[PDB]
Unconditional design. Structure first.
Length: 60
């Protein structure tokens, strides 16, 4: 079945989203929970994360 096509960013991105030191992993692990369970739109979730981070990243 192969069906492989992770390069647009999912690869490097993945290993990245798994580090955002400003949020909890419950929610974060959530988006990616779909990356591993369903590596179809893993990239898109990544966008949703950096967003959840940039907002709650600073000490605000």
């Amino acid at each position: 079945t192969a069906d492989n096509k992770f390069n647009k960013e999912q690869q490097n991105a993945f290993y990245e989203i798994l580090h955002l030191p400003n949020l909890n992993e419950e929610q974060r692990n959530g988006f990616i929970q779909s990356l591993k369970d369903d590596p179809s739109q893993s990239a898109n979730l990544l966008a949703e994360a950096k967003k959840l981070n940039d907002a709650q990243a600073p000490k605000a």
